[PDB]
Structures are given as structure tokens and as C-alpha cells.
Amino acid sequence: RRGALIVLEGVDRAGKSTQSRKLVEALCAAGHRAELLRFPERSTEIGKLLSSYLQKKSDVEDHSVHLLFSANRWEQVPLIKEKLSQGVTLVVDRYAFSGVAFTGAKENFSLDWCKQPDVGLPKPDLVLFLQLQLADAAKRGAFGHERYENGAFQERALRCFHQLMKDTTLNWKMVDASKSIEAVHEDIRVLSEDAIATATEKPLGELWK
């Protein structure tokens, strides 16, 4: 009985990391085997190159960095498939959708070109998108020093996310991330329990193919 692959995507400061941590904790407390992943995974050799880029400690050509972000997912595919096959549900803080939306926000990058490197990855059984109005986000801190942490760029990435949500091959669920941490958590947790039950029924799919 395989585990489910659950991805959290969402606007800046919408609560992806908070909700991913809370979801794994709740699932494990309810008797499931669940583990947390995040992308980029900065611990690998590729992940270190990505972390330096995001911190502005290095500059990387736009196409090359897009491909590093995708390679950083592929290097974890053997682990992802092993865990799901062993019955472990994986909760993932960002995935290929962020990969496409962030590079796709740059000039002269088509969504098609951006998707291709990730074609074939393990397909999420559930893609949560944490929606939040900017007035409500603003109250969640201030733009930091990392790359991409600016309004105009975030807005272009959001438009790309909306283009990806048109894709009916995926199980997208919108989450109102403007509520309390606990209320958002309960909405996510219930959606996740449902997905876990059904994932044991169909084989793990392949993304965008």
C-alpha cells in the first residue's frame, strides 16, 4: 500500500514551510508513516550551488540555474520512489511547480521550455496551493535579502502558477492560507488524509507526460 506524494506550493509567506512541518507531525501522530522533503534540497552538491545563488553569493546563468533546480529534484527521485513504495507518505515543500513559475517569471522563458526538465518526475497525488492576498502577506514580515524576494517578481511567478493550475492532469486543491496557522492546518490535514487513502489505489504517476 504505497504512500502518497503531497506537495505544498503557494504565494510568498503563505505558510508552505509551516504547514508542511505541521502536516507531517499530525500525520505521524495519527499513525501514518510520513516524512518531510523540501526543494531546493540544499544539502547536496547541487543544492549548495543553488543555496549560494539564492543568497546572492554567486551569480548563475538563468538557464543553467533552472536546470540545476530540476536536477536537484531528480537526484532525490530514487529516494522518493523507495519511500512511497514502502508505504511512507511524503510531504514536499515546493516542487517542480515553483521551478517553472520562478524561471517562467524571467524574461524570454516559455512555460513549455521551463517544464521540460521536470517531465517524468514522480507525479504528486495532491498539489496544495496556499493562496493569500498581499495585504495579508505583508503582515508576515518584510522582503529579505534572498533572490526573488520582491513584489514585481512574485507577481510574475504568481501568474505562472495560475497557468499551471489550468492543467487538469493534476489534483490541485486551493487552500485559503489567510486563516490562522491552526485553521489552515486543519484544512490541509483533512485534504491530505483523503489523498492518502486513495493513493493506495492507483500507481504513482509521471508528471507532465
Ligand X SMILES: Nc1ncnc2c1ncn2[C@@H]1O[C@H](COP(=O)(O)OP(=O)(O)NP(=O)(O)O)[C@@H](O)[C@H]1O
Binding residues for ATP: 13-18, 94, 179, 189
Question: 94-114: string of b/e by CB count within 10 Å (b at 16+)?
Answer: bbbbbbbbbbbbbeebeeeeb
Tell me the three-class secondary structure of 142-205, residue by residue.
CCCCCCCCCHHHHHHHHHHHHHHCCCCCCCEEEEECCCCHHHHHHHHHHHHHHHHHHHCCCCCC
Q: Residue 39: name its binding partner from ligand X, ligand FDM, Mg ion, none (Cβ under 5 to 8 Å by kind).
A: ligand FDM
Residue 97, binding choice from ligand X, ligand FDM, Mg ion, none, Cβ under 5 to 8 Å by partner class = none
Whole-number minimum distance, CB 72 to ligand X, in Å? 16
Residue 88 Cβ vs ligand FDM, minimum distance, rounded to whole Å: 21
Q: Which of 28, 30, 119, 181 binds ligand X (CB under 6 A)?
A: 181
Decide if residue 18 touches Mg ion (CB under 5 A).
no
Q: Is 15 in the site for ligand X (CB under 6 A)?
A: yes
The yes or no reply on residue 17 touching Mg ion (CB under 5 A) is yes
Interface residues with ligand FDM (CB under 6 A)? 39-40, 54, 69, 94, 98-99, 102, 148
- Pick from 18, 51, 52, 131: which binds ligand X (CB under 6 A)? 18
Tell me if 180 contacts ligand X by CB under 6 A: yes
Pick one of Mg ion, ligand FDM, ligand X, none as the site partner of residue 98 (Cβ within 5 to 8 A by kind).
ligand FDM
Look at residues 99, 107, 112, 102 and name the one whose alpha carbon lies nearest to residue 70. 99
Counting contacts by CB under 6 A, is residue 140 touching ligand X? yes
By CB atoms closer than 10 A (0-12, 13-18, 19+), residue 121 is buried
180 binds, among ligand FDM, Mg ion, ligand X, none (CB under 5 to 8 A by kind): ligand X
- The side-by-side arrangement of strands in the sheet containing 5-10 is 34-38, 89-93, 5-10, 126-131, 172-176
The dihedral region occupied by 130, where left means phi > 0, alpha psi between -120 and 50, and beta the remainder, is beta
Binding site for ligand X (CB under 6 A): 10, 12-18, 140-141, 177, 180-181, 184
